[PDB]
């Protein structure tokens, strides 16, 4: 069972597969809010 606890900084990509266009992109330094 791979375990992936994103309890610390990461970058992301809300993107579409079939086409490969990126909708939203960025990184999360502070998860607070």
């Amino acid at each position: 069972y791979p375990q992936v606890i994103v309890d610390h900084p990461f970058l992301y990509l809300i993107r579409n597969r079939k086409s490969g266009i990126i909708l939203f992109m960025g990184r999360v330094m502070n998860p607070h809010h």
């Binding site: 266009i21 990126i22 939203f24 960025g26 330094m29």
Partner: protein
């Protein structure tokens, strides 16, 4: 230049120094420059 393009802005918004969150929409900006490059 789809993704390599958007992986450059991302590479810009973090060169400022402030290790703060950054969030953009390549699709939206790419769409604005598109119209923008329609005749101006």
């Amino acid at each position: 230049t789809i993704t390599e393009w958007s992986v450059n802005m991302y590479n810009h918004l973090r060169g400022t120094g402030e290790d703060e969150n950054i969030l953009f929409s390549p699709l939206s900006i790419a769409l604005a420059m598109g119209m923008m490059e329609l005749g101006a």
